[PDB]
Amino acid sequence: EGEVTELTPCETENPKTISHVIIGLKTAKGTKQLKLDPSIFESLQKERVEAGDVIYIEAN
Amino acid sequence: AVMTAVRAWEFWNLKTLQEREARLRLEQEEAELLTYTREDAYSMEYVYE
Amino acid sequence: DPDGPFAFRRKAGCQYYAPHLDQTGNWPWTSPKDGGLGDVRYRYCLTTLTVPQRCIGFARRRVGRGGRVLLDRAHSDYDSVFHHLDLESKDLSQILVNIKSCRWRHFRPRTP
Amino acid sequence: MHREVYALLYSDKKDAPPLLPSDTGQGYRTVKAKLGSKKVRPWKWMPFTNPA
Amino acid sequence: VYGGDEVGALVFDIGSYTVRAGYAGEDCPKVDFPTAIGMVVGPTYYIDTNALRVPRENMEAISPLKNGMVEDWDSFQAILDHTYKMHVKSEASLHPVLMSEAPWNTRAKREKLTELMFEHYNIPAFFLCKTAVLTAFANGRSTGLILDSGATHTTAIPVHDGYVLQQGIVKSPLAGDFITMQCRELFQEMNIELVPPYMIASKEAVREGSPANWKRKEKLPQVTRSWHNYMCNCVIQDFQASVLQVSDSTYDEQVAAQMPTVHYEFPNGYNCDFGAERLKIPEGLFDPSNVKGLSGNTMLGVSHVVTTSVGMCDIDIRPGLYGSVIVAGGNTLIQSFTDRLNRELSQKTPPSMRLKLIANNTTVERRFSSWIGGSILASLGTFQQMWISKQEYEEGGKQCVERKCP
Ligand SMILES: Nc1ncnc2c1ncn2[C@@H]1O[C@H](COP(=O)(O)OP(=O)(O)OP(=O)(O)O)[C@@H](O)[C@H]1O
Ligand SMILES: [Mg+2]
């Protein structure tokens, strides 16, 4: 969980193709970048997550 | 071609993530904090129980 | 008799300071574990800030030249653990046990 | 490990820098109104008598 | 009551190697130009690096300081004028001046310096503090043993409560000049022709030990032997800084030979590996009995100078002296000098007293420690009572310095 600071997709050549979705999360303790599975892009737009939005992501 | 490209890409990704971790390590070797808020400096008293 | 050459003889209206025997003396700005006076103005203790809400590690409040109150910081090998430390694996477990027993003085800011 | 640290000038060459207090740390824009609402008091280069 | 007050005072630290000057409150001297100045037969004076490094006919290289004390007051006035006009860019009568002085400065020289500063420069206030006291203050220590190894002398000065214990001062002639002489002798033994960089028009890369393939500058004017010697001393000091290293323990030929060599390239393109000879030279500071100069001499090693200086003080203060050893001076920057000194002192210090060397092994903290302490002292609000005012110099006369400045 944390405040979203970036939602930059990671473009790549397929062996536009994305291989990861980097989400930056900020908390009062600090900031962390997560190399999430690309499929999470559907849920991000479904939830309308934007920079400066507080979110939480369950591991499972 | 897919069989060869998949392995070549997996290696490229391993290399790219290692370079990213190295860049993060370099960024963390740099000083993290140099300033703190005015409220913490004067508007509060530090206590311990 | 053996002491006689340098024997101690109290005199009326006099007071004396006992010599250091158990531990060699040290400067006031040094820990009592190192024979120092351990003067509290030079002591560095774990400190937590309000922004960011993270423990910065060992720190001491010092007034600067223009009256600006500065937080000096001391390096420690466990600095990463102190960064992770808040709200009270082997080294982390020992540190947590020491803090929960309040063996370490860890300051937190509060409004007056 | 050490419970507390003692030093005069600084503890070690690897010591982290001291944290100086400052406003505008979170950006100038957020503190624009606070800084703009006031005006600084005048400072002078003036002679002073030292009774010592 | 509050933080120390800054009254815009100046801090001057005129050493035999470089003249350090600046404004009080700063953490570093704003200027440090070589003390040696060019003189043309008052005589025309060339003082700063920009003027010293260009050849001139019938220009001699001289220094106002002798044995750590000013001898030629004309060159001293010239250096002060140059410092003011070029670097300070402020009127002397507007800023108080705090100057350092040698621990062994004479009364008459102090009086003459005070007279000069007040009559000639018309300064508003003056103060004269010892280099050892300023070095101790720069480290936040009110007491301790200062160990200064400059260009002229290696001196240990015991300081207690901010006062120099003059009876405990022990001085040795082994200093930067001795190391320069040793390097000169080594180059002479190796038949290395010291070509100053001003004589080199162009140079070509050559193999190790190969004869130098360099072109001499044309239309070069005749230069005095003093200026040529000064340039040679400059290149030798560069060699000292770049190559020389103090052995971590008592010098051994086998251990020195086993360690890797260091390669140095001279200005004329000549290059060679200095092998173990780079280690033998700094050992003379620690074991002078082995120096080719005079084996039977009475000079004392730096560690012996340290132990002797403390031994002359009250035993009640020796715990403070050993508990705070402050190393200063440019000659102490030689590699591993601090480590070797610490080892030798720990071996020679009594186990009943704690020995601690302050970790100040950096060029700025070692060379400018006196200036740093002077800036600190001049910036203290409590120090504003110590200033010698012009009115005080008028009423108490030239002798007033004897009582106001301890
Ligand atoms: N990094 C270095 N390595 C070796 N020697 C050095 C280094 N830096 C400076 N020196 C030498 O230090 C010597 C003394 O310089 P320093 O600035 O300490 O003298 P000073 O205090 O002005 O003079 P003095 O005490 O002789 O009156 C010089 O001869 C210089 O060549
Ligand atoms: Mg010196």
Side-chain angles (χ1 to χ4, degrees):
Chain A
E1 69 185 40
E3 175 203 333
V4 173
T5 61
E6 58 181 27
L7 292 169
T8 56
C10 285
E11 302 108 320
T12 184
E13 296 299 334
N14 190 51
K16 298 188 65 167
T17 299
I18 64 165
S19 193
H20 293 267
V21 177
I22 305 306
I23 298 192
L25 289 179
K26 181 168 60 176
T27 56
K29 194 182 200 75
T31 307
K32 180 64 65 71
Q33 286 183 13
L34 308 179
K35 300 168 294 186
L36 305 182
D37 184 292
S39 307
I40 209 173
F41 83 108
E42 303 185 347
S43 301
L44 287 170
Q45 296 321 111
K46 186 185 71 71
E47 292 300 284
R48 302 180 178 89
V49 178
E50 290 192 40
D53 298 355
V54 184
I55 70 169
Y56 62 100
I57 301 169
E58 66 190 63
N60 187 50
Chain B
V2 167
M3 285 290 178
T4 63
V6 160
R7 296 192 84 262
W9 187 96
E10 195 72 10
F11 286 130
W12 169 90
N13 200 59
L14 183 78
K15 177 63 172 84
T16 303
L17 289 174
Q18 287 289 345
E19 187 167 320
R20 179 179 167 279
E21 286 187 39
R23 206 197 80 214
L24 265 59
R25 187 183 295 164
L26 287 169
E27 285 181 35
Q28 287 174 355
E29 181 178 311
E30 167 188 288
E32 173 77 359
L33 285 176
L34 292 170
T35 289
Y36 78 117
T37 75
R38 173 179 288 278
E39 286 72 16
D40 279 305
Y42 320 95
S43 196
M44 293 192 188
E45 296 194 325
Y46 291 74
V47 299
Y48 168 70
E49 302 109 324
Chain C
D1 177 62
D3 53 347
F6 295 102
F8 183 29
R9 305 189 193 284
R10 181 181 186 259
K11 198 186 183 306
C14 293
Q15 297 181 0
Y16 309 84
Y17 297 110
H20 280 300
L21 306 171
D22 302 358
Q23 297 186 355
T24 304
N26 208 347
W27 303 108
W29 50 81
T30 65
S31 178
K33 191 175 180 181
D34 201 21
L37 185 62
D39 189 344
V40 302
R41 82 173 66 75
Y42 314 108
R43 189 180 65 194
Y44 294 74
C45 294
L46 296 179
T47 300
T48 44
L49 293 181
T50 313
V51 178
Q53 298 194 3
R54 171 171 58 185
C55 179
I56 61 163
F58 290 112
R60 70 168 185 209
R61 279 171 60 83
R62 180 180 55 75
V63 184
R65 252 181 283 187
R68 292 163 62 76
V69 180
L70 320 185
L71 283 170
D72 300 339
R73 286 154 63 208
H75 178 268
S76 188
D77 216 332
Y78 304 96
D79 51 357
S80 306
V81 188
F82 303 141
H83 295 172
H84 302 166
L85 173 70
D86 200 3
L87 308 178
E88 298 182 349
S89 60
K90 295 184 180 182
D91 292 348
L92 173 63
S93 77
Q94 188 64 55
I95 285 163
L96 284 172
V97 167
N98 291 347
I99 295 164
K100 285 177 177 183
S101 58
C102 298
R103 292 175 181 162
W104 296 353
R105 180 175 281 100
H106 189 173
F107 292 98
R108 304 189 163 272
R110 76 163 185 184
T111 57
Chain D
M1 70 284 289
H2 304 295
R3 305 185 180 174
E4 301 165 328
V5 174
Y6 283 84
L8 182 52
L9 260 55
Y10 58 86
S11 85
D12 200 4
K13 70 198 68 69
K14 296 186 290 185
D15 281 355
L19 304 180
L20 308 189
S22 81
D23 310 283
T24 71
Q26 314 92 329
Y28 163 62
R29 187 180 188 261
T30 197
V31 301
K32 181 171 69 76
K34 294 163 57 69
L35 295 172
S37 73
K38 310 274 197 162
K39 65 189 294 293
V40 304
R41 287 171 284 182
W43 288 68
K44 187 176 179 182
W45 184 253
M46 62 175 71
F48 73 98
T49 177
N50 184 351
Chain E
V1 285
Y2 302 101
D5 284 302
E6 292 180 17
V7 299
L10 259 58
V11 180
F12 285 176
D13 180 272
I14 297 158
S16 191
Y17 177 53
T18 55
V19 172
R20 295 151 287 251
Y23 313 89
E26 296 274 347
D27 57 354
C28 179
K30 246 60 189 176
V31 75
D32 60 331
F33 57 89
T35 305
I37 65 171
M39 185 271 290
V40 183
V41 182
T44 297
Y45 291 120
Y46 301 92
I47 295 159
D48 58 341
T49 306
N50 291 21
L52 284 167
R53 300 273 275 193
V54 289
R56 265 185 296 278
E57 173 172 33
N58 298 334
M59 186 189 75
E60 300 278 347
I62 55 172
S63 177
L65 271 58
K66 182 185 189 184
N67 302 325
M69 295 177 282
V70 54
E71 183 188 52
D72 181 25
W73 303 93
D74 297 352
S75 48
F76 198 72
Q77 283 172 45
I79 283 180
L80 285 168
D81 288 354
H82 176 77
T83 305
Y84 274 113
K85 174 177 179 179
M86 292 295 180
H87 314 122
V88 172
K89 293 202 167 193
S90 194
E91 187 63 32
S93 59
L94 296 176
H95 300 279
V97 182
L98 179 141
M99 279 199 283
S100 66
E101 57 159 357
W104 56 82
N105 203 29
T106 72
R107 174 192 282 114
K109 205 161 297 294
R110 282 164 47 89
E111 281 180 31
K112 189 59 181 181
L113 181 59
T114 306
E115 173 192 298
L116 173 65
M117 291 309 292
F118 276 114
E119 303 283 347
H120 195 306
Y121 296 97
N122 199 22
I123 64 179
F126 184 59
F127 197 89
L128 201 59
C129 195
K130 306 284 189 292
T131 51
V133 175
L134 301 186
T135 303
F137 283 5
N139 291 277
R141 263 66 169 201
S142 58
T143 177
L145 187 81
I146 306 306
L147 176 71
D148 186 9
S149 186
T152 316
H153 298 288
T154 287
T155 314
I157 309 100
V159 181
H160 180 46
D161 286 9
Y163 300 101
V164 162
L165 303 184
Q166 287 188 307
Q167 307 298 331
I169 293 163
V170 176
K171 58 190 292 192
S172 170
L174 301 172
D177 280 355
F178 166 76
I179 298 297
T180 296
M181 192 175 290
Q182 288 272 76
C183 296
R184 188 95 67 77
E185 285 195 27
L186 172 64
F187 296 157
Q188 181 174 353
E189 283 195 301
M190 295 204 293
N191 296 289
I192 298 181
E193 183 168 20
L194 279 172
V195 176
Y198 83 90
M199 305 210 305
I200 308 160
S202 68
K203 67 190 181 188
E204 294 294 330
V206 297
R207 265 181 296 106
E208 54 268 41
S210 183
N213 183 17
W214 67 287
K215 299 295 183 181
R216 176 184 283 99
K217 287 272 195 67
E218 68 280 349
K219 312 304 176 182
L220 281 177
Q222 60 175 355
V223 299
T224 66
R225 299 300 93 192
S226 60
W227 192 78
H228 181 75
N229 288 351
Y230 172 75
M231 299 295 282
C232 294
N233 285 3
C234 292
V235 68
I236 291 159
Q237 287 157 0
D238 176 59
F239 163 84
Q240 291 164 236
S242 60
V243 176
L244 300 184
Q245 173 163 18
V246 177
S247 308
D248 197 37
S249 286
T250 312
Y251 177 86
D252 197 349
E253 185 67 26
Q254 296 324 292
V255 181
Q258 294 289 341
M259 81 172 294
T261 63
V262 173
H263 172 280
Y264 181 78
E265 183 173 353
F266 287 85
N268 68 346
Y270 188 83
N271 51 0
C272 188
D273 279 20
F274 276 84
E277 290 87 336
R278 59 185 284 260
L279 262 60
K280 192 180 180 74
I281 285 178
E283 191 72 5
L285 304 176
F286 294 83
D287 185 50
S289 304
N290 281 15
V291 176
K292 291 186 178 183
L294 285 178
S295 178
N297 212 336
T298 57
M299 288 172 296
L300 296 181
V302 64
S303 58
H304 292 182
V305 164
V306 162
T307 53
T308 303
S309 173
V310 182
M312 300 182 75
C313 303
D314 184 344
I315 190 150
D316 282 337
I317 304 311
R318 297 184 199 153
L321 296 172
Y322 279 108
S324 178
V325 175
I326 303 178
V327 184
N331 186 255
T332 73
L333 291 159
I334 303 174
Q335 281 285 357
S336 310
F337 177 94
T338 311
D339 301 334
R340 173 68 171 283
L341 174 75
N342 179 50
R343 188 177 189 88
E344 286 200 5
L345 290 185
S346 76
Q347 185 173 10
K348 294 174 191 290
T349 187
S352 58
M353 292 187 287
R354 203 175 300 275
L355 171 82
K356 176 61 177 182
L357 273 73
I358 278 157
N360 75 335
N361 189 28
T362 71
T363 300
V364 173
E365 293 167 321
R366 289 289 179 86
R367 296 196 62 246
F368 311 144
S369 61
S370 297
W371 188 93
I372 303 301
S375 185
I376 289 163
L377 186 58
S379 300
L380 316 181
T382 309
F383 178 77
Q384 307 309 312
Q385 309 178 18
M386 303 294 297
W387 291 112
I388 295 170
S389 71
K390 187 178 180 292
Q391 180 176 348
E392 282 177 307
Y393 169 81
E394 288 285 353
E395 184 168 36
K398 179 168 65 86
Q399 187 269 344
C400 67
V401 70
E402 181 173 41
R403 210 175 186 278
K404 287 276 296 202
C405 290

